Write a protein that binds this ligand. Structure first.
Ligand SMILES: Cc1ncc(COP(=O)(O)O)c(CNc2conc2O)c1O
Ligand SMILES: Cc1ncc(COP(=O)(O)O)c(CNc2conc2O)c1O
Lengths: 382, 380
């Protein structure tokens, strides 16, 4: 629980707590919150975010694939967990003994699983319906009835839920959203019995139309304090608190003379006498090469990145001479300046979701709770 | 280990072995090969690559920072390890105890280290000289002599080597290169005595001028079978064998009707009756969103990724009806077709170095040695 390089990410768990608690109050009392923590909680720390979400009101968790669910179980999480993606029928028994719910969307998957499992633990399934996303899910009434039939036949197979996912809930215009919502209601009629859990809402849908969430919402991106899209920021019911920040420190500082070049390709040349700082973070840490024309914060001021970004380090133009060890902020606030994940996303020309997920296993995560350090997670630590 | 998702990377250790052994045969008997395995061996697997490189002829290893060095030690590697980047003066004792060599380039660093460490383990330092990279290293005579003086005075500090790094060794034009080389020889004259290890060459430099590498080369990108740059591919002394491949399997297949949308934002619309496959790999796996429109391999044919790439999945247009479980190759060979890391780098508008480093911890690595499966490493 220690690290030996001056580069780290900070995760504010009080922000995550507040983001989830505010949702708990916004939603009808009889609507459960499933916190989605796949991809190591969007790069924030799976078990740490999960524990906090459960404290704030969430009652279930969601991950992308089986390995992620098993990892949470090994770390002591006992809350129900749903695997949103595909799994192998041969792993049905493992999921059952570990009390992990599985997503199902095709009958031939059940055919195979039935021939491999015979109890005694029940397997809870969530039927995925494709209402316009085109990713995973059933689309035909025949296939839907067949899946339900195979589940009812098996004494250890249980249909615990049914859901769909929206492709454009974060768009101001709600035409396609309305289409998917209506399709969902229509497909719901294909079921002979309504399962106990009906869900469809992600962050954008739950925050914009809390009354149209049925009995469970799958809360992701907004839990981390990130807007589903900048376009709906002014439509959010409550203010979101950004939980992720990234920092480093100067490990070298030198003054260059006019003509001297910097980094690979010698693409940058100091025109006048200027101070250059080197920080221990590079593209192998998720600070991609495409960010070469971006900037960082040092001493409350913007400092542009100079030359090409390296695998483990990069250089920046300092306003003047600063001492080694001076804190640098890549994502976060310093004085009156701020660099948000959305800013980084803009220059990488991607969405905020992708940024924290790309900050590699190499960067330690320091967790804060009650304005104090709770723990440090170093993926390659002793 | 084992994994429960049909997406995995394969690392051919035989390719790594060959790439290193071929260099061993081009170098002089007294020149050491220091295998560069920082960033988890450029995303290939730190201990697996290190072990293989050592068997092939390398005698030392290099990493980016202390934690990476400590990880190798904890995994059984006992060969010498040099930390190429910065470290804290307070960690000198830890480095000494684990027999890890440290890079040094500031006198104030040594002053602090001296005050905090008094033995009993010796600490081997490698002096970094900035000859034009502008990253790390000393630049003037005064600083250099002060550093040497501080090392000589301490009973447990030892100057094991000194080095520099080239910024344009991969470029056809060798003007800036020759400039850095000449500066290095000049700066070497500031030392009262030549340390036991003098090094300066990386993959490009070692492969193009094997006779001007001094006594140790730092072999990186080429060890993995990737050319330092497209410009020097024809200048390489021997053919490099690419070691990394990435695969997945179709988990869903469906036929869409004209007018139907695919993925977030519904940016894709089927113009005719099409077969769409879903594979369990997405941007949280390092298969970045920018790879939309790129082509993957399925049933020996190229198929485009359609619609936006999601966090854990993406969709491809199939050449027709294929069964669930069909193998999809994102990087590698399938029949007569091949997709190289260079091709992925081209689409992403970056360099090959960045690609395997970005394939995340979430993707298991399967290792092959002697044409047999040797081990499975699943970070989670
Ligand atoms: C099935 C499912 N439900 C809920 C969520 C949470 O979405 P949210 O972070 O907007 O609240 C996701 C993540 N959605 C994804 C975002 O990018 N790729 C994904 O698969 C998901 O895949
Ligand atoms: C000091 C040092 N020596 C040797 C190497 C190996 O270089 P090579 O993979 O071209 O043989 C690197 C990696 N240099 C980096 C490559 O990309 N960013 C870097 O910082 C390095 O930093």
């Amino acid at each position: 629980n220690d690290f030996h390089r001056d580069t780290w990410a900070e995760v504010d768990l009080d922000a995550i707590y507040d983001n989830v608690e505010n949702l708990r109050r916004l939603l009808p009392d009889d609507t459960h919150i499933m916190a989605v923590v796949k991809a190591n909680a969007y790069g924030h720390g799976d078990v740490q975010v999960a524990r906090t979400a459960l404290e704030a009101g969430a009652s279930r968790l969601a991950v992308a694939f089986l390995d992620e669910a098993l990892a949470l179980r090994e770390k002591g999480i006992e809350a129900p967990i749903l695997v949103l993606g595909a799994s192998r029928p041969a792993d049905a028994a493992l999921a059952a003994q570990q009390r992990i719910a599985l997503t199902v969307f095709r009958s031939d998957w059940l055919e195979e699983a039935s021939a491999l499992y015979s109890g005694p633990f029940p397997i809870h399934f969530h039927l995925k319906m494709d209402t316009g996303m085109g990713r995973l899910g059933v689309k035909d009434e025949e296939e839907t009835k067949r899946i339900v039939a195979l589940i009812e036949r098996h004494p250890h197979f249980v249909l615990e839920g049914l859901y769909t996912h929206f492709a454009t809930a974060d768009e101001v215009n709600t035409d396609y959203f309305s289409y998917q919502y209506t399709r969902f209601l229509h497909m719901l009629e294909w079921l002979p019995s309504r399962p106990p859990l009906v869900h469809c809402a992600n962050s954008a849908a739950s925050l914009r139309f809390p009354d149209r969430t049925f009995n469970m919402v799958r809360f992701g991106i907004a839990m981390y304090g990130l807007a589903p899209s900048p376009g709906i920021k002014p439509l959010l019911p409550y203010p979101l608190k950004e939980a992720f920040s990234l920092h480093s420190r100067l490990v070298h500082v030198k003054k260059l003379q006019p003509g001297e070049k910097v980094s690979f390709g010698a693409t940058y040349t100091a025109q006048t006498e200027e101070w250059i700082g080197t920080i221990p973070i590079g593209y192998a840490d998720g600070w991609l090469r495409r960010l070469q024309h971006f900037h960082v914060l040092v001493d409350g001021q913007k400092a542009p990145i100079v030359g090409r970004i390296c695998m483990d380090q990069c250089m920046i133009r300092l306003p003047g001479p600063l001492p080694v060890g001076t804190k640098v902020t890549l994502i976060g606030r310093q004085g009156d300046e701020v660099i948000s994940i959305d800013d980084v996303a803009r220059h990488l020309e991607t969405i905020n979701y992708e940024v924290p997920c790309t900050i590699s296993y190499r960067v330690p995560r320091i967790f804060f709770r009650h304005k104090r350090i709770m723990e440090v997670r170093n993926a390659i630590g002793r």
